[PDB]
Every structure is written in structure tokens, then in C-alpha cells.
Design a protein around this ligand. Structure first.
Ligand SMILES: C#CCN(Cc1ccc2[nH]c(N)nc(=O)c2c1)c1ccc(C(=O)N[C@@H](CCC(=O)O)C(=O)O)cc1
Ligand SMILES: C#CCN(Cc1ccc2[nH]c(N)nc(=O)c2c1)c1ccc(C(=O)N[C@@H](CCC(=O)O)C(=O)O)cc1
Ligand SMILES: *c1cc(=O)[nH]c(=O)n1[C@H]1C[C@H](O)[C@@H](COP(=O)(O)O)O1
Ligand SMILES: *c1cc(=O)[nH]c(=O)n1[C@H]1C[C@H](O)[C@@H](COP(=O)(O)O)O1
Lengths: 264, 264
């Protein structure tokens, strides 16, 4: 896509060589913002072939409050294996924080149904937020949240969402992170009888790993194809009731897929 | 200031009419980003005289880990008066969360000490964050954090910071928060012997209150002047020890005044 490709060029043009914990080394920039009107089409990259199967399963799983990868395995999704323990646990990552953020006085807050009650009763608050950034449990998480915090907005009967990504693997992670939040926005908008608006991505440390420059120049030598279209074949009684098969992607004709190694 | 004036017009040009919680009405935009190179001058707005004693005390107030307006009144800062209770309390707002995030198991996490430690021992970290968005104690706050989450980044011996602002009063709050965060950056740079970098500002609900229309018009018609220079008279033995008297600004000759009411 237009936006992602210009971001990729920005990191190359303006990036600085930094060392990272994985020991790989990146080219990185700090702070970037991009916007996608979900009315133009579903933001799934076309310059490389993506797999919706795994984006959809990881999203169903977070909505479930699940943080053990077995579900992921039942479905042939291995994106998280590298970080699970012997039991398949990741610790209290995304799904846990989303659905049961632990308070100091022994409560758990379900952030997802709270955002849904606001959308329904005061679509105008300035506090329609879900955070995965639980400071108190960061130490128990297999990896700290990359997509850390997000806020919903309703203006002309359209639902928008701005995500704050503290850490971004531009090559492997981003295409996946954008496809995922876009699916979410469609999910919520369908629950609320609203139209989809814009998806705003905002980044912290936005980088390209060292072992990814070749794949980066190869991708960049390509012209984006028209954006795919998302179709939902049902309106479930709740956002927690969606099924993998309720979704169809129409008109996706991507350029060939490009392989790159994930960093540690 | 230029980026600052430019956002004021964007709001007038594209803002959506919203019914506010305060019941005041607003012109709003969702998702905005601006960047200030700290090497170019201290970002205090010049299109209106800004009063720095209150910017200074509020921040020293936050780093002390205080939620009582007592300290502030002793320094004549009246800013948080309409929100505190009868004991002068705000609940577990900013200062509290920076300094003593309460885990679910009794303990406290000192996010400013964790940050200083990181800047010193692991400057390449993609996790140098301070979050005031403790979902677990929102209920207990006089008002939910506006300036909600921030991240530090070290690149060529320079120190950058990105703030995520979920709600912004463009006329009244914006200039304040901008100076506040430009100020911490210099304090951390000094205490870490780093160069100042960029201060990146990202907001969510970015708005103009209906009763700030005259003040805005007035403002938009004045010419930005050159940015002051920030001077730190002494080098405290810790970020916990700065003081009103430690900071001097030179080169500031702002335009006269503008008085506007605050939204309750
Ligand atoms: C983000 C995210 C969710 N997740 C989690 C996840 C966990 C840790 C991370 N660590 C690093 N260094 N980069 C990440 O993007 C990353 C992503 C993913 C994990 C792996 C792949 C990956 O290997 N994928 C594809 C290639 C296609 C692509 O790069 O989309 C593959 O099938 O090889 C994608 C997403
Ligand atoms: C953000 C923030 C911190 N705070 C907190 C704060 C809390 C609630 C809010 N409520 C609303 N509706 N808008 C805000 O900007 C706002 C700001 C501030 C509060 C008041 C002023 C203010 O009235 N300023 C005047 C004169 C103040 C003076 O005498 O110095 C001015 O034009 O500066 C500034 C900052
Ligand atoms: C995290 C997972 C995901 O959702 N998206 C991301 O891009 N990643 C990336 C960013 C970075 O390369 C890494 C995490 O490492 P760190 O916590 O920043 O050290 O995975
Ligand atoms: C919050 C305080 C701050 O430091 N910055 C500000 O800009 N404000 C503002 C924004 C908004 O108008 C109001 C808070 O209201 P809400 O919680 O967003 O409804 O004060």
C-alpha cells in the first residue's frame, strides 16, 4: 500500500542505526503517523502476499481473553510459538489486559465491553480507550505489548480508531498489526450500527531489522494493487461471537510473498 | 508558534461539531501529530504570553508524586482548583501513577526511577515508557489523565520523547502540556548527559471549545516570534531535586494576553 511503502522509504531515508535487545540491529526512526480511510478498501498489503487466516485467528483469540497458544495451534497458527513457555503460555499479554485488567482492590475490568457500553451510551466521550500497557504485570509477560493503547472516535456516524504502537517491526509486524485493527474497527462498527471511518496508526520506535533490507528493496520495487474488500456474512449477538467463516476477502491479488526471519 | 497556529486553523477548517461532557460544545478532529526540535528553541507559545511558574510547579508536583493541591497553593498555582475535593485531593492522578503505580499484589512501581535506570543502562530499549492510564483507578480520579502515556528514545546521543494526548483543549491546555513535556526532556537530558532531541506530540480528540472562538481568531492573526532559550541554573543530584529557581528562560517576548474561561 501507498502509505506503508512511503513509511518503508522514510525509515531507509531517515533511519539511524541502533542496537536492539534481539541483538539484530535496526535502522529506526521515532514517531510517525499514517491514516487509512476504511471506506477506500480493506488495508491488507498487496506488494507481498498476506495470510488472513492468522490475522483473523489471533484477533478472535484476544477477544476471547486467551493467552495460551493451544487455540492458535488447533487452527494451525504458529506466529507466537517462539515466545511461549513449555505449557504454551505467554503470560498476561493482550487478551488478558483487554478482558480482565486486574485492579489493586481485587476487581477485573473488561475493557472490550466497557468500550462497547460507551459507544452505545456516550459515543462522544473523549475516554473510549483500551490499554494493554499494565505496568504492574509487564514482568510476567513473554513479550511487552507492541500495539500498546488505542482510542475510538465517532463523528459523522463513522467509527475511527487511533492505535499507539510503541514498537514496530516495519517489515514483518506492521502489515499484520494494521489488518488486525481494521478488522476490529469493522467488528465494532457492525455491532454499533455505525459506518467504518478512519484507522490512524501512530508509531514509537519504527524500525527495519538488518536481516530485512533485501526484502525491503524487493517490496519497494513493486506497485500496489487495488485494495481488497471485506465482507461479513452475519451480525452475531456480540463482538465475542464472531466465527472465522463469517469473513470473506474479495478482490485480493497480491504480488508474490517475500520471506524474512523474525528476531528473537 | 507555527505548527501550533497551523493546528488551530485545521480545527476551524475541519472540526466536527460535538456536544461535550461539560455541555459546552466543541469543534473537534481525531488524530493529529506535531514535532518540535528542541535544538531550535524552547517551545513556549509567543502568540500569547505564557506564564511559566505554574508550568514549573505542576511538573515538580508530579515528580514529587503528589495529588494534593496543597503544595501548589503554597506556590500560588491555582490551576487544579476546580477539580480537587474538600481536602484538596484529586485521587490517584498523574503524580501518583508516575511514582507509585500500585500492582495488584500490594507493591508499587516507580515509573520515573525505572526510566532513569533504562536511559542509563539500556538506552536502545524500545520500552522506555511512563503510563498514567491505570484503568484500575480511573474511577477514583478527579478527572481522567489527558496527557496519558509517553515514551523516550535515544538516538545519536540525543533524547526524544513522544506523548500521546487522548484529549486536548487546543486554546487552553495545549501550550501548557507542550512546555511541560519540553521541560521534562531537558531535565532527563541533563540527568542523563544526553543532548535534547525531538518532542513529538500525538493527540486523540483534539478540540476547540465553542467559547474560545474569539480568542482563537485573535490568536490566529498574530505573528509567531523566535523561541526562547531554556537555561537550567544548577545540576541537582537527581531529577527529584529541581526547583522553581533552577530554570530561567531568555529570549521570550510574547504577544500580549488572551483570557478565556475553562470548561468545567
Ligand atoms: C505483528 C504481529 C503478530 N505476530 C507476533 C510477533 C511477535 C514478536 C515479534 N517479534 C519481532 N521481531 N517482530 C514481529 O513482528 C513480531 C511479531 C507475528 C509473528 C510472526 C509473524 C511472521 O513470521 N510472519 C509471516 C511473514 C508474513 C509477515 O511478515 O506478515 C510468516 O508467515 O513468516 C507475523 C506476525
Ligand atoms: C493542561 C493543563 C494544566 N491545567 C489542567 C487542566 C485541567 C482541566 C482542563 N479542563 C479543560 N476544560 N481544559 C483544560 O485545558 C484543562 C486543563 C490547567 C488548568 C487551567 C489553565 C488556565 O486556566 N490558564 C490560563 C491562566 C492560568 C494562569 O493564571 O497562569 C492561561 O491562559 O494560561 C491552564 C492549565
Ligand atoms: C511486536 C509484536 C507486534 O504485534 N508487532 C511488532 O511489530 N512487534 C515487534 C517490534 C519489535 O521488533 C519486537 C518486539 O521487541 P521489543 O519489545 O521492542 O524489544 O516485535
Ligand atoms: C486535560 C488536562 C490537560 O492537561 N490537558 C487538557 O488539555 N485537558 C483538557 C481536555 C478536555 O477538554 C478536558 C478534559 O475533559 P475530558 O476528560 O476529555 O472529558 O480538559
Amino acid at each position: 500500500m501507498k502509505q506503508y511503502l512511503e513509511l518503508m522509504q522514510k525509515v531507509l531515508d531517515e533511519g539511524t542505526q541502533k542496537n536492539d535487545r534481539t541483538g539484530t540491529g535496526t535502522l529506526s526512526i521515532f514517531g510517525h503517523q499514517m491514516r487509512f480511510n476504511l471506506q477506500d478498501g480493506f488495508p491488507l498489503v498487496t506488494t507481498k502476499r498476506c495470510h488472513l487466516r492468522s490475522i483473523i485467528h489471533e484477533l478472535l483469540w484476544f477477544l476471547q481473553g486467551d493467552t495460551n497458544i493451544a487455540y492458535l495451534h488447533e487452527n494451525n497458527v504458529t506466529i507466537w510459538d517462539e515466545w511461549a513457555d513449555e505449557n504454551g503460555d505467554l503470560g498476561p499479554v493482550y487478551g488478558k489486559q483487554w478482558r480482565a485488567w486486574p485492579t489493586p482492590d481485587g476487581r477485573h475490568i473488561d475493557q472490550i465491553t466497557t468500550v462497547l457500553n460507551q459507544l452505545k451510551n456516550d459515543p462522544d466521550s473523549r475516554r473510549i480507550i483500551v490499554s494493554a500497557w499494565n505496568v504492574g504485570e509487564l514482568d510476567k509477560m513473554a513479550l511487552a505489548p507492541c500495539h500498546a493503547f488505542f482510542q475510538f472516535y465517532v463523528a459523522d456516524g463513522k467509527l475511527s480508531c487511533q492505535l499507539y504502537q510503541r514498537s514496530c517491526d516495519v517489515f514483518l509486524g506492521l502489515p499484520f498489526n494494521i489488518a488486525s485493527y481494521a478488522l476490529l474497527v469493522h467488528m465494532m462498527a457492525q455491532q454499533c450500527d455505525l459506518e467504518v471511518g478512519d484507522f490512524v496508526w501512530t508509531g514509537g520506535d519504527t524500525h527495519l531489522y538488518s536481516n530485512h533490507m533485501d526484502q525491503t528493496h524487493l517490496q519497494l520495487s513493486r506497485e500496489p494493487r487495488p485494495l481488497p474488500k471485506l465482507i461479513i456474512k452475519r451480525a452475531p449477538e456480540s463482538i465475542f461471537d464472531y466465527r472465522f467463516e463469517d469473513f470473506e476477502i474479495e478482490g485480493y491479488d497480491p504480488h508474490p510473498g517475500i520471506k524474512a526471519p523474525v528476531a528473537i
